[PDB]
mmCIF file with all atom_site columns, C-alpha atoms in Angstrom:
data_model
loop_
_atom_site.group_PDB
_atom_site.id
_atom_site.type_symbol
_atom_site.label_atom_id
_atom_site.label_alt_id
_atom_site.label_comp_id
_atom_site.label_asym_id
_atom_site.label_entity_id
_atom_site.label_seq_id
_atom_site.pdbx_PDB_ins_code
_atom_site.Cartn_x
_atom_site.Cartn_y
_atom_site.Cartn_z
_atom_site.occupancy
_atom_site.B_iso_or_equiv
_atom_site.pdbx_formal_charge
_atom_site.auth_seq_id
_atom_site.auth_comp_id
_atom_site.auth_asym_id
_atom_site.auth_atom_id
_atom_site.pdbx_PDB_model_num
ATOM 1   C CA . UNK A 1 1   ? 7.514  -11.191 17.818 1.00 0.00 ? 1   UNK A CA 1
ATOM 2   C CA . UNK A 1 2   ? 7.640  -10.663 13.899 1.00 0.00 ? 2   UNK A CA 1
ATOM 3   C CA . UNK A 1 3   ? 9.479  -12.025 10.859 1.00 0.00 ? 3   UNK A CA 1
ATOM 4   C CA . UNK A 1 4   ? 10.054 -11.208 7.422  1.00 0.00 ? 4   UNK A CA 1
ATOM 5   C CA . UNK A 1 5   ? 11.675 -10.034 4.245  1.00 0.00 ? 5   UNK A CA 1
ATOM 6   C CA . UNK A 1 6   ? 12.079 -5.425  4.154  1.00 0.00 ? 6   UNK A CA 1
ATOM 7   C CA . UNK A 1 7   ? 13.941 -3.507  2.011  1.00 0.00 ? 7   UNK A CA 1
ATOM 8   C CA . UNK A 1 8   ? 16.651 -1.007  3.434  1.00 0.00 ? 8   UNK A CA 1
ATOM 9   C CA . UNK A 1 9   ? 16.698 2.119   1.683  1.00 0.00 ? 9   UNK A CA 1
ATOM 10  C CA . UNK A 1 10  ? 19.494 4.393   3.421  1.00 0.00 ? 10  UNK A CA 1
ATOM 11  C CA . UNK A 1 11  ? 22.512 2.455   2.888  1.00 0.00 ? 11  UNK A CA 1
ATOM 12  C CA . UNK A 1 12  ? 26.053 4.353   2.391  1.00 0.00 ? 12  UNK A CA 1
ATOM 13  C CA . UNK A 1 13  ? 27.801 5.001   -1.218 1.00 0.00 ? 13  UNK A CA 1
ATOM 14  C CA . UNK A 1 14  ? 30.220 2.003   -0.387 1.00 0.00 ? 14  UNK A CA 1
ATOM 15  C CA . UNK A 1 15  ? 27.229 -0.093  -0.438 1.00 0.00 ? 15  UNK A CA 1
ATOM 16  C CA . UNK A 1 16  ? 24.782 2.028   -1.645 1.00 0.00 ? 16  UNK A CA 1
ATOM 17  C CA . UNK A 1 17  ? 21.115 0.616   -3.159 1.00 0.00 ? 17  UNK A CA 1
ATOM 18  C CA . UNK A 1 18  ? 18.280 -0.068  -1.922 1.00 0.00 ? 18  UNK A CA 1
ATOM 19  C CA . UNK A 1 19  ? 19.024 -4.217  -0.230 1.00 0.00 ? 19  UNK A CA 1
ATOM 20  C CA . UNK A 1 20  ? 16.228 -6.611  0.684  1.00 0.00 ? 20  UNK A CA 1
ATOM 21  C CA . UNK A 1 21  ? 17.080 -8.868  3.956  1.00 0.00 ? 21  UNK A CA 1
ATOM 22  C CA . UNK A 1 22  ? 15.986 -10.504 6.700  1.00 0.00 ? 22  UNK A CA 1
ATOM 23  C CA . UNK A 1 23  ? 14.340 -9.191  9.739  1.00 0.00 ? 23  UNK A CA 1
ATOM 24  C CA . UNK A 1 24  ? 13.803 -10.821 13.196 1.00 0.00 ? 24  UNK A CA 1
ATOM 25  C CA . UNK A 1 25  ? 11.690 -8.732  15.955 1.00 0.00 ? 25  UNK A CA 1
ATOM 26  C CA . UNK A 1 26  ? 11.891 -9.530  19.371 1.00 0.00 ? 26  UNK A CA 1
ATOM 27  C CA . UNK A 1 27  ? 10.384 -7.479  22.748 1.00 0.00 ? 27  UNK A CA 1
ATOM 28  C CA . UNK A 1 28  ? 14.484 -7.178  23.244 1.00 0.00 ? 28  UNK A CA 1
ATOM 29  C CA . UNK A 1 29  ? 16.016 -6.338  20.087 1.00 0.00 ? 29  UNK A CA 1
ATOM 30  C CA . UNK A 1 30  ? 16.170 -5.884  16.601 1.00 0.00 ? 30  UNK A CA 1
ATOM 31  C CA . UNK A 1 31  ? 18.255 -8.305  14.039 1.00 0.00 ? 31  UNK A CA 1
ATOM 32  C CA . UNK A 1 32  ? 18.661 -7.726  10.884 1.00 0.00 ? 32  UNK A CA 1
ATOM 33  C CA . UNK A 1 33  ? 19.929 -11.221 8.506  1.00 0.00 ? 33  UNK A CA 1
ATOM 34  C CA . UNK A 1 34  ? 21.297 -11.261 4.705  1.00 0.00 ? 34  UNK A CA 1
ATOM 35  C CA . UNK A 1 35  ? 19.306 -14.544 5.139  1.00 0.00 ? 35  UNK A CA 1
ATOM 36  C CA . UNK A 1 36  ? 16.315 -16.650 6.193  1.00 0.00 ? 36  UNK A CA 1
ATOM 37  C CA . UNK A 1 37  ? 18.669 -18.706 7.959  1.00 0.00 ? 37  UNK A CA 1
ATOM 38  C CA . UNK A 1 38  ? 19.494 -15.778 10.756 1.00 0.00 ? 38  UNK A CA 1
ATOM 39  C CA . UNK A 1 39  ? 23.347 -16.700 10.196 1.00 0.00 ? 39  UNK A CA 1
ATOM 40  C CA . UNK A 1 40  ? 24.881 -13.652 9.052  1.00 0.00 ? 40  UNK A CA 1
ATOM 41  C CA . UNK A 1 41  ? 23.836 -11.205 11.591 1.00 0.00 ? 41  UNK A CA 1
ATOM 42  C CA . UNK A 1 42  ? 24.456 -8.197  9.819  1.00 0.00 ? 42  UNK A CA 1
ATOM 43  C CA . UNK A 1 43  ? 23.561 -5.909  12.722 1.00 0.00 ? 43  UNK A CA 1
ATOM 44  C CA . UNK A 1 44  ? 21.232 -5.409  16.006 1.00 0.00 ? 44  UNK A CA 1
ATOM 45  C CA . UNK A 1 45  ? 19.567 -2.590  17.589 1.00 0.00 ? 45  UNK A CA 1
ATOM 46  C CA . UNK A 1 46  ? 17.679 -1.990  20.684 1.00 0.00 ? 46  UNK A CA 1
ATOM 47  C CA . UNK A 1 47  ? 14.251 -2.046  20.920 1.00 0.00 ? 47  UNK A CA 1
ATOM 48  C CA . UNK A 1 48  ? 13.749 0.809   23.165 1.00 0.00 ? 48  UNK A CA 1
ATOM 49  C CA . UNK A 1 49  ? 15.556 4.771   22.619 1.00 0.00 ? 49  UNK A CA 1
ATOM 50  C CA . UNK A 1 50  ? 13.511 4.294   19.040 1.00 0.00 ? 50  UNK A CA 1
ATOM 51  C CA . UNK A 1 51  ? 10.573 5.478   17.684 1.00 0.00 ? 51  UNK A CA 1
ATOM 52  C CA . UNK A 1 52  ? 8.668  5.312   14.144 1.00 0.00 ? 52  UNK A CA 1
ATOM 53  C CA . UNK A 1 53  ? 7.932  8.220   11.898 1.00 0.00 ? 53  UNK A CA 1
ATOM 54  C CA . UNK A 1 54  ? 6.483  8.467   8.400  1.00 0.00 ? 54  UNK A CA 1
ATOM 55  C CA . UNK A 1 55  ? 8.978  9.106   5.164  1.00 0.00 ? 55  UNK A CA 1
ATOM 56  C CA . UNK A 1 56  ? 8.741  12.135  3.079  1.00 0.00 ? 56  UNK A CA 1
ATOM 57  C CA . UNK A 1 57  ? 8.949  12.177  -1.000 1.00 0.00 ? 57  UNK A CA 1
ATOM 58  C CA . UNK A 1 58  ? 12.733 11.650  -0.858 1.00 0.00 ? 58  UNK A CA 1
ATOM 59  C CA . UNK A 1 59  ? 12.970 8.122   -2.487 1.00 0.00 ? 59  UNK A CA 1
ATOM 60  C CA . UNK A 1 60  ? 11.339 6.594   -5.778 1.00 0.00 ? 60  UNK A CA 1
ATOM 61  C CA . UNK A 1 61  ? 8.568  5.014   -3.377 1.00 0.00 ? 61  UNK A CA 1
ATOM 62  C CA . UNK A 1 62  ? 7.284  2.239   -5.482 1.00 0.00 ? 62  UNK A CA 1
ATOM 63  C CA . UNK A 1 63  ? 7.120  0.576   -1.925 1.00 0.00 ? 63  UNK A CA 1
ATOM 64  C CA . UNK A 1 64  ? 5.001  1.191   1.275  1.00 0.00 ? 64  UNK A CA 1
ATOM 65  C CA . UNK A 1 65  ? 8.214  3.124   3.365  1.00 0.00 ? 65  UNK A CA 1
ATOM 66  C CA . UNK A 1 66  ? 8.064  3.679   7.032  1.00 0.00 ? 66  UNK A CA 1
ATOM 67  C CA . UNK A 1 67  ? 11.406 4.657   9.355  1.00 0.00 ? 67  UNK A CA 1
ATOM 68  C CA . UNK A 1 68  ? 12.551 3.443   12.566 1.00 0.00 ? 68  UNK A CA 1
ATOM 69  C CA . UNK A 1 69  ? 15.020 6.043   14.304 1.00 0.00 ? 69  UNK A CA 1
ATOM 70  C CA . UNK A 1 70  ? 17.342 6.559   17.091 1.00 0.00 ? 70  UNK A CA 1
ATOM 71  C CA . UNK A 1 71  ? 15.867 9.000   19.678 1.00 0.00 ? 71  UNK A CA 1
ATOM 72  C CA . UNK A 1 72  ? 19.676 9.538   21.051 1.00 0.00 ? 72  UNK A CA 1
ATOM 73  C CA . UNK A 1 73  ? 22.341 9.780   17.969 1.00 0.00 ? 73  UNK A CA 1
ATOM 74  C CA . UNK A 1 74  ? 21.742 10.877  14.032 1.00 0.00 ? 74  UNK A CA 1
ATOM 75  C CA . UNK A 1 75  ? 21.977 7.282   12.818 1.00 0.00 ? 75  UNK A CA 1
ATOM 76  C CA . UNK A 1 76  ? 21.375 3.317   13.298 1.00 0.00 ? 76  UNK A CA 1
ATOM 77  C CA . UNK A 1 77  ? 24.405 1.452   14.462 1.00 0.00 ? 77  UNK A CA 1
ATOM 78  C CA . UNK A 1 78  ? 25.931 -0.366  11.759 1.00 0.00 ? 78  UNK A CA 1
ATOM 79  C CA . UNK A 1 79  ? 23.648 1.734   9.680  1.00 0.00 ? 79  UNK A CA 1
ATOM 80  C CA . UNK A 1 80  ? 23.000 4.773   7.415  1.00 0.00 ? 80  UNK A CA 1
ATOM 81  C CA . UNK A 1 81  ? 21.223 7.323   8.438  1.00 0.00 ? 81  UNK A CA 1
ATOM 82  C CA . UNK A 1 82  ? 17.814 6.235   10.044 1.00 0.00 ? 82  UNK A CA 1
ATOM 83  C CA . UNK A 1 83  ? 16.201 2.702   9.217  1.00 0.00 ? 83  UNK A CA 1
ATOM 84  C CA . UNK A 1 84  ? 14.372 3.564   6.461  1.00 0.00 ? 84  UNK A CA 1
ATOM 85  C CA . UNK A 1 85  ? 11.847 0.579   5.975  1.00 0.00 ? 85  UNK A CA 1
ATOM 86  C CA . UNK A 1 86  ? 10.283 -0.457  2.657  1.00 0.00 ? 86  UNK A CA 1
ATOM 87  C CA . UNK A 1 87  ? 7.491  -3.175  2.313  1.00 0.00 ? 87  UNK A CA 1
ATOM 88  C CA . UNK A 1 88  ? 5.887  -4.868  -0.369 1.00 0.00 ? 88  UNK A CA 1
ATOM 89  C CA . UNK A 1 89  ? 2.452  -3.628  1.101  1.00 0.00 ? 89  UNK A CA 1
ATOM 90  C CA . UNK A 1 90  ? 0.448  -1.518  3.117  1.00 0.00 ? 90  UNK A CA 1
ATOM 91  C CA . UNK A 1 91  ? -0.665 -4.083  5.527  1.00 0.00 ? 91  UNK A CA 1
ATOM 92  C CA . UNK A 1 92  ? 3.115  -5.222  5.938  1.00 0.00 ? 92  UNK A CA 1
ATOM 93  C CA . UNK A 1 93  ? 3.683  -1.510  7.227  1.00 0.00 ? 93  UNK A CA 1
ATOM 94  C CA . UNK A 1 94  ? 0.928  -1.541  9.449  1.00 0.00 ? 94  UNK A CA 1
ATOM 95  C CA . UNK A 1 95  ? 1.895  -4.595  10.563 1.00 0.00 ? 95  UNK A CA 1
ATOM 96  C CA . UNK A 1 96  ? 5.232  -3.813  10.880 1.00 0.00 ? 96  UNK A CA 1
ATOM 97  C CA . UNK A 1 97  ? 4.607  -0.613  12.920 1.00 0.00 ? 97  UNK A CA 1
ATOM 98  C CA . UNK A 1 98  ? 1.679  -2.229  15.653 1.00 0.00 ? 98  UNK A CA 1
ATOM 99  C CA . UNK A 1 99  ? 4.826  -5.161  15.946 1.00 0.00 ? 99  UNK A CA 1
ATOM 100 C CA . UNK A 1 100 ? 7.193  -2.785  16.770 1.00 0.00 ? 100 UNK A CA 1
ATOM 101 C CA . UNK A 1 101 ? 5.177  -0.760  19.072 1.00 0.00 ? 101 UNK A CA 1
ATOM 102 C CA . UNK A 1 102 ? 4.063  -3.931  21.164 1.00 0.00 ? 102 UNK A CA 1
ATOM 103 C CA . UNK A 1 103 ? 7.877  -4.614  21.373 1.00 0.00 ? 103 UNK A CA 1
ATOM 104 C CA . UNK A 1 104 ? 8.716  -1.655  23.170 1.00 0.00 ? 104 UNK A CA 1
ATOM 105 C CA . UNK A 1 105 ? 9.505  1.308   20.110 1.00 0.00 ? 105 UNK A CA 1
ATOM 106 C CA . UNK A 1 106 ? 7.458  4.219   20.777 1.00 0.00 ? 106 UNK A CA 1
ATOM 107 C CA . UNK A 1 107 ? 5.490  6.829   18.687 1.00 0.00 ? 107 UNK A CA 1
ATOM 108 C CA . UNK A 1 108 ? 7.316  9.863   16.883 1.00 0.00 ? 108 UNK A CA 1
#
């Protein structure tokens, strides 16, 4: 449905810092690339049992943040805490948020 480049914000001491890769949105699933090339497959998630929320002041937000949770455990699979989502704009959020909504992810 949607592709492009966001920013992961919640990612574990082992790995920790903020990491730009590459997203592909489907009405299915979610897959998340280290590349453009969709080759590394880093990790997938459903589309549905999700939902998007707004971010509080808990991160230097120098970029337009929005999160993508699980509805049914405390954390992403192959994740850190909830998908926290940064974007180089405001539009990319919106965007972002009316793509995943179409796809099946429902409102907080």
């Amino acid at each position: 449905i949607r592709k492009g480049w966001l920013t992961i914000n919640n990612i574990g001491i082992m790995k920790g810092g903020s990491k730009e890769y590459w997203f592909v949105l489907t009405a299915e699933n979610l897959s998340w690339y280290k590349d453009d090339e969709e080759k590394e497959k880093k990790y997938m998630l459903s589309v549905d049992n999700l939902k998007l929320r707004d971010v509080e002041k808990g991160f230097m937000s120098s970029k337009h943040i929005f999160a993508l949770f699980n509805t049914e455990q405390r954390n992403v699979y192959k994740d850190y805490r909830q998908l926290e989502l940064a974007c180089e704009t405001q539009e990319e959020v919106d965007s972002w948020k009316a793509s995943f909504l179409r796809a099946g992810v429902y409102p907080e």
